């Protein structure tokens, strides 16, 4: 597990090679989600991103598929695209086909581990969230049971 990281296309920041298939596995600790944001996108554009693409894949699901050349028009933020998953595992797959004649320079993305708010998103009386988990608390009369979930009088 890891709290943060970076994913760059092959040969970044220069042009990526052709006929290339690369994969990255993102893992953060339990109790954490993943926020993955792209700060650079320069990829050959095609319909449905069927030639060159970046696939963001969750468990047996496709979170996203990116191609083309985009950048932020916000002066206060360099983020082009972003994904926020409530899981501790993610996959990034970069695919490049036969020809890169136009010399596209690929992508640059970063991910960080976010905290799951288990109380907003589990306790009989009071849920207190903390970074990486939660605990349950009770009014001054009740006591916590052995399951650490339910409270009752003595």
């Amino acid at each position, epitope marked *: 597990p890891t709290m943060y990281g970076e994913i760059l296309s092959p040969n970044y920041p220069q042009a990526y090679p052709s006929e290339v298939e690369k994969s990255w596995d993102i893992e953060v600790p339990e109790g954490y989600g993943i926020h993955l944001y792209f700060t650079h996108l320069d990829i050959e554009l095609s319909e449905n991103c069927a030639y060159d693409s970046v696939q963001i894949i969750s468990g047996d699901t496709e979170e996203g598929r990116l191609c083309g050349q*985009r*950048s932020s*028009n*916000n*002066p206060h*933020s360099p*983020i*082009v695209e972003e994904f926020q998953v409530p899981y501790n595992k993610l996959q990034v797959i970069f695919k490049s086909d036969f020809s890169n004649e136009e010399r596209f320079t690929g992508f640059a993305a970063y991910y960080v581990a976010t905290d799951i708010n288990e109380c907003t998103d589990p306790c009989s009386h009071f849920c207190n969230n903390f970074i990486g988990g939660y605990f349950c608390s009770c009014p001054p009369e009740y006591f916590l049971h052995d399951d650490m979930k339910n409270c009752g009088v003595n």
Partner: antibody, heavy 113, light 110 residues
Framework: VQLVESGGGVVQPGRSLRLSCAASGFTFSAYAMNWIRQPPGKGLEWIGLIYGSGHEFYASWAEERVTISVDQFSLKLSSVTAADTAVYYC??????????????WGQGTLVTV | QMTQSPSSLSASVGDRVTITCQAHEILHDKKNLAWYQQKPGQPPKLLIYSASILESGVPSRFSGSGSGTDFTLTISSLQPEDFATYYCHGEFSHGSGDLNHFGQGTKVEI
């Protein structure tokens, strides 16, 4: 996804103009959000935007007279003149930090002065 | 910022329509130009974005093209439902005027 606006009516000149818009099926914090207006018989005129991160930008003719807020998506226009009567639209951009197009529009509230 | 030509155009059903837009600056990402179609009493409908990409559900007669400053919308075959007003919309990089600007419009009549 859907956008619905409200607040359209008759307003005396010099008074205040406030319009509101509610989304349906998406959150306002993930897309760049725009106010546009169209005078009767005239063309479309971009008023302003707020990006998903939360930064508000305005047109040159409205940088001193307009405040755009997110909560909801509200537009506030002061010193309302007989030139401010128009159908006001709310629109959504393609991404968070750029527009590139408006694919999801509202319905448009007519405001008379 | 945006100059759309012509202001109006009259053509019969089945002819080709050309509408030009000039930005006088470089668009954001060099290609952030959208084309919309509006009918009376209705909001505008996005036809084209990124200066060439047709939106889902748009007939194939509509076409887009253009370089950094000059852009063109083409209707290869007019239809009874193609008579409306058309707008170009440009996104511009921060620090060069307004972020977004619409063209004057072009009303098409039989």
């Amino acid at each position: 996804v859907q956008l619905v606006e409200s607040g359209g009516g008759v307003v005396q000149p010099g008074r205040s103009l406030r319009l509101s818009c509610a989304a349906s099926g998406f959150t306002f914090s993930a897309y760049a959000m725009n106010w546009i207006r169209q005078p009767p018989g005239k063309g479309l005129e971009w008023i302003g935007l707020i990006y998903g991160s939360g930064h508000e930008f305005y047109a040159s003719w409205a940088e001193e007279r307009v405040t755009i807020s997110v909560d909801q998506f509200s537009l506030k226009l002061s010193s309302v003149t007989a030139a401010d009567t128009a159908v006001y639209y709310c629109a959504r951009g393609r991404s968070k930090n750029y527009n590139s197009d408006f694919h999801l529009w509202g319905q448009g509230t007519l405001v008379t002065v | 910022q945006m100059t759309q030509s012509p202001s109006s155009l009259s053509a019969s059903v089945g002819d080709r329509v050309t509408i030009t837009c000039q930005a006088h600056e470089i668009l954001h990402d060099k290609k952030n130009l959208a084309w919309y179609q509006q009918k009376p009493g209705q909001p505008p409908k996005l036809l084209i974005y990124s200066a060439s990409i047709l939106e889902s559900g748009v007939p194939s007669r509509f076409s887009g093209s253009g370089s950094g400053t000059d852009f063109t919308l083409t209707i290869s075959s007019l239809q009874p439902e193609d008579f409306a007003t058309y707008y170009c919309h440009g996104e511009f990089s921060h620090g060069s005027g307004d972020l977004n600007h619409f063209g004057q419009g072009t009303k098409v009549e039989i």
